[PDB]
Structure formats: C-alpha cells, structure tokens
Amino acid sequence: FPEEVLEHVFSFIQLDKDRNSVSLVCKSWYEIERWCRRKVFIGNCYAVSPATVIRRFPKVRSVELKGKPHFADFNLVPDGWGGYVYPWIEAMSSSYTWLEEIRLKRMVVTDDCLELIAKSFKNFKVLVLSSCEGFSTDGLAAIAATCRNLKELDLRESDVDDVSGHWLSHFPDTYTSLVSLNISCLASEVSFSALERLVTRCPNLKSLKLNRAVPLEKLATLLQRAPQLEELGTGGYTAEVRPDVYSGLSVALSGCKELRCLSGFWDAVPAYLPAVYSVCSRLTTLNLSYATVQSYDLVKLLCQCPKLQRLWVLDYIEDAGLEVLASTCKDLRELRVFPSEPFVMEPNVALTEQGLVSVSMGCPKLESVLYFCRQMTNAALITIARNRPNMTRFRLCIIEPKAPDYLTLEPLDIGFGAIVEHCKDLRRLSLSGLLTDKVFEYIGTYAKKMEMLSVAFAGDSDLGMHHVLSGCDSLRKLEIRDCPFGDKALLANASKLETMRSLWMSSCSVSFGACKLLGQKMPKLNVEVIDERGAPDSRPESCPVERVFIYRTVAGPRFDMPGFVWNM
Amino acid sequence: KIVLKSSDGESFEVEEAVALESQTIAHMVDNGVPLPNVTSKILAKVIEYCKRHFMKIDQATLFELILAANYLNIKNLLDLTCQTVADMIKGKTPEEIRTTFNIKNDFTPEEEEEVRRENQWAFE
Amino acid sequence: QVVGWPPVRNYRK
Ligand SMILES: O=P(O)(O)O[C@H]1[C@H](OP(=O)(O)O)[C@@H](OP(=O)(O)O)[C@H](OP(=O)(O)O)[C@@H](OP(=O)(O)O)[C@H]1OP(=O)(O)O
Ligand SMILES: O=C(O)Cc1c[nH]c2ccccc12
C-alpha cells in the first residue's frame, strides 16, 4: 500500500500492544508506525530515556509516565529516591510542541515542570497528577493562567504545597473549556466566588471533585450552576442541621439528572446524607471512604442504589450492611472496604469474613475486591473462590501480621490456594495472614494469569519465592516485604526478572553479595540497593540490604540516584 | 449525468451526486472521465458503495478496493476499507500479520530483538 | 507495631 493508505489503517489501531506488533512486521511498518503513534505509555520512567522516546516517536500527543513503585504509598521508599519528571518535560518541551496530555503517577513534579508545560504546549488539554508530590499552588497558577485549551486538571491523591488558594483565580474570563476538575487533595481554600464563576462559564464541565474547604452550605450554589455534572465530589459534608439548608441541597442535587458518581463526604453528618437519595437510582460509583457514619445510615443509602457498580466504604458498613449490599446491588463489580481504625488491634466494628462471603454469594458480577478485616478462615476463602470463579482482582488485608485461621489456627494456605485454583483469570492478588511456603506452591501451580502479587510477613524459605518466579507465567510486578526470601530464589530465577516490570524486596534476606552478583550477571537490569546505613561495602557481603529494587531497562543505570541508592 | 471510463475502457453512467463522492472525479469534472488506475470490476464495487451511501469480499478484491478509494479520494469508503484492514491487524503477532499480508520480515534477528525489547520493556 | 503496616495511607493518630 501507499504510505498514506498504511498511515490511515494505523489510525484505527490505538492499543499499545497492537502498535508494538505493527512496528515489528517489517522495516517499512516500523517507520510508518513510529511517525503516526499518538500516545505512549511508560509504566516505569527509568525503563527508557526521554531522548529515546522522542527520537523514535516524534508526533506523540499523549504521554503517561509512572515513577516510584507501589510500596512508596506505605512509606517504604525514602524521600529523594527518584521519579523526577523534569528531564521528560524538558526533553518534550522542544520536541512535542503539539503535545496535549500528560498523565503522571508517583512522580516528583515541581513548579518549574508546571511552568515549562504551560509555556511549551499551546494545545495542552489534560493534566493528571496521580499521587505526585513536589509542586505548589504557584505551579497550578501557571497552568490556570496560561493553558487556554485546558480540559482536565486532576490532582488525585497528590501532595501539594498549599501556599494559597488564589491560584484558581488565574483562569481568565475567556477560559470556558474545563471538563474535569479534581482538587480534592488541596488543603487550601480556593476563592469561592472565582470557583462559582469558573463553573458557570464552563458548560462542558462533567466532573467536579471539590476540596474539603468548600463547606456543605455552599454546595447547592455550585450544583445549580452545573446541572449537567456526571461526577461530583462534594466538599465538606457537615453543617448545623437546618430545614432550609437541607431543602436547598436536596433540590440542587435532584436537578442533577446525569450524576452517576458521587464521592467526598468529609465529616459527613447523617442528617444530610438523604439529600443525595434522588441521585442514587442511577448511581454507578459511590465513594464513602471518608464518611464515618454507621452501618444503618450506610444501609439506608445503599438500599436506594440498585445500579451500583463500584462501592468504596469504611468497615462501618459491618457484616449486616454487606448482607444488604449483596441483596440490593446485583450489578456490583468492585467492592473496597477500608479500615476505620487500622491502627487498633481489637475490632471496633462487626466486620468479619462473613461480610465478604455475603457479597461473593449475592453479587454475580463482583470481580474486584479490596477488603481490610481482622479475622479470616480458610472456609470463608474457599466459599468465596467457589462462588466467584470470575474474580480478577482479589486483595485481602488481615490487619494483624501472621494471623492464622481464627477457628482452626491453621495457615491460610488452602484458602488462598482455592482463590488461585478457582479464579482462573485472576490478574491481581495480595495475601496476608499466617502463610507458609505451601501457599506460594499453590500460586506457582495455579495463578497463571496473575500479573501483580503483593506479599508481606509470609513464607518459610526461598522455596516460597522460587515457586512464584518459576510458575507464574504472566507475572509483571512482584513486591515483597518482611519475608524469609533471599539470595537463593532470586539468583536461581534471574532470567525471569527480564520478563517483569520490577521486583521489590524490603526487609527480606537478600545479601549485598547477591545483589552485586545479580547486577554482574544481568547487565540489562538495574539492581538498586536502597539502604540508609551508608556504603554497603562498609558491611560484610553477607549482610542483608534494607531494600532492593530491580527493574529491566533499555536505558542502563539512572543518572539521578541519591546518596543512599547504589546500582549494582 | 456523468460517464466514468475504467482502465478496461468500459463506460459507466452514474448520477452526478454519486460521481462527486470521489474528490478525484470531482476535480476532473463530457466525453468521459478516464480512470486509468481503476479496473471495471473495482469501479463497479465503488459505484455500488457510493450509490448506497459489502466487505464480505476476498483479500485481493479488498486490496484493489482500498487502492481505488485512495486513488479516487472517497473518504467514507477509505475509512471503511482501512478499518477492515486494521481489524485484520488487531490482536495478531507480527508473524501472523505478515502471513495474512504476505510480507517478508526484512529485519536482522538482532534488529528485531532490539525493537521487541524496547517495545515490551518501555512501551507496553 | 510495624512501619507501613497495615498498608494504608491514613495518618496515625
Ligand atoms: O496496568 P499497570 O501499570 O500494572 O497499573 C495498575 C492498574 O492501573 P492502570 O489503570 O494505571 O492500568 C491497576 O488498575 P486495574 O488494571 O486493576 O483496573 C491499579 O490498581 P487500582 O485499581 O488500585 O488503581 C494499580 O495501582 P496500585 O498499584 O496503586 O493499586 C496499577 O499499578 P501501578 O501501581 O503500577 O500504577
Ligand atoms: O493490596 C493491598 O493494598 C493490601 C495488601 C494485602 N496484602 C498485602 C501485602 C503487601 C502490601 C499490601 C497488601
């Protein structure tokens, strides 16, 4: 075919995996594909250099980059480790001049990055900073002032330096293009007058997730200005209980006919929750993670949500609330039950294994679970696995490390074995409770589609990790803390590591000597020892490192390691 | 109102609005509009399409059809034919692709290893 | 007590 014809065929091919196969059919396709590829997804920012991406794919309009590993969320990655996006922005600034979208996760993003984005990318439309840190409201002010075509500013779970809420006032009066605004992580109060005018002049606004600083008494005002909203994150959800205030909120929310997703609810007062009831016949997503209201209050809401597909809730729901959920929400796909008091040992709520069993039995489309509880049985896990062979993500956190089945006192090996045995398309698993090498044997035998596994306080010996690396065909990320896994399984399965995004091991048994030898053996891996005790050389080769992070890369050793990171 | 002549020298008579679906004919637009790069078989098929405005055709016929849509600059036809070809690409390995399209791999093993590693490690 | 356990983003109080 003529090159224009082939470029046009490829315009209908947008999945990364398909673009990649295309680039490998012949030399001609390689060149044509690279020159009209529209988006790149870089799941590990250090797996490749900016120059390499920009040279290969010159016409990119959308970039997604991910930095720090998942365990950074749990304070296991010391500050300064890395993840700086500036070199990427700098490199793109002179090349990707038609650039439209930047989506970043766990990166360090500075005001200099944000200023360079504003001034470099005239067509800039989408900024998502997901669990990012290193910038302030001043950087946001630069985006607001300058990005005249901006459609999405989404700051989900980011840590922002809250210098001043004045940044939002920088959107000029001629700006009208906003579609999605998520400021839920911002501690500083924006000018409410500026927010009200912004919402009023942006008729394509579909998603508005506010910060806690917008008080419940002002919510109706904004909702009246945005009746087309599909997603709403409330601000503060507390006020003096008054008839006129409740009625105003009720009327405003009932005028929002397209609302499918509701979240926020900080400081929620039970007296004001019924105001959302009109909305909850059509709701598909409800996030009640921050509402500390009790089971019965949650049930009255949930009874009104027959179309619910995704629920995030505190363990205040309790077993009785989950039993009601199981009866009501037949389209439920995803349930996340978060701990109300994660740092207390004795239970503060009646949420046990029984709630998860109830939903597994009652919700035929339930395929994603994240569940925090204090007790579990093998019988429960076996019932779950048998009821829900369609499960694709199963994340179970028993609060006390190494807690056995509370009825039999046995490890939870057979229970998690049943999950991997019965749930053939399980892509994600996290384990907890008392676990021996046997569970890892089951995982290696049965979990052939598992891509991500998270493990803590589990196993007996290197045989455990060996079973996983040897048997888990689809494995992409393995992240382990505080397990008796060490040199033997790691080096015995070194080649497996070239088939994965990364392996994280902290507080395990891996010696500095094994890290050095692995680095020697596998020059296309970056084997990073992350250790705050000073030079690993200053200790015997046999001494375990605090952490090791290993990832395949085409770029070679990183140029930005802090003093406490060493590449082998 | 317009006569189109195929590369086989056979005349087709079509309503003006049908002929003007092709930007190439549009620009040329009368003893006949000669179309030296379009066969009668494939001009027949193109006309069917333009009159109606079907893909249950074989591989060769399909490839003659995209070339004609491109040459005649009929955008909606080009879209449909290109989507159909893309759909023969989606989900396939490079080996399955060049089997379907009869393309020879012209990479050295070393060239192809470098590209595959980069694709999977950096871009997926 | 254990660092980063349970695996949540909550402040300790
Ligand atoms: O495909 P990956 O690069 O391995 O990303 C996964 C994936 O998120 P993406 O939507 O970015 O692909 C998970 O989502 P699902 O495929 O299960 O829908 C997400 O899980 P969450 O639902 O909790 O957002 C998880 O994020 P996390 O590890 O923070 O749980 C994240 O992995 P990363 O940690 O590598 O971003
Ligand atoms: O998946 C989660 O977030 C919770 C969880 C359960 N077991 C875990 C082991 C290590 C890290 C996190 C988890």
Side-chain angles (χ1 to χ4, degrees), chain A residues 70-71 74 370 372 395-397 430-432 454-456, chain C residues 5 7:
Chain A
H70 177 212
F71 274 17
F74 317 130
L370 172 60
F372 285 79
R395 293 164 63 184
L396 175 70
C397 174
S430 64
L431 295 167
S432 51
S454 304
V455 193
Chain C
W5 201 262

Side-chain angles (χ1 to χ4, degrees), chain B residues 41-57:
Chain B
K41 177 174 138 194
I42 278 70
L43 193 57
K45 182 115 263 217
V46 170
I47 293 171
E48 302 183 20
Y49 177 94
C50 295
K51 297 168 144 175
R52 201 198 296 106
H53 283 80
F54 180 76
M55 287 291 87
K56 229 185 172 189
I57 49 174

Side-chain angles (χ1 to χ4, degrees), chain A residues 482-509:
Chain A
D482 295 276
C483 293
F485 300 156
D487 299 0
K488 287 179 217 62
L490 180 65
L491 292 170
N493 297 98
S495 63
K496 178 64 168 177
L497 305 176
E498 279 185 341
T499 73
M500 302 166 56
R501 178 187 293 167
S502 65
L503 162 65
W504 170 281
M505 298 178 73
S506 55
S507 297
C508 294
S509 292

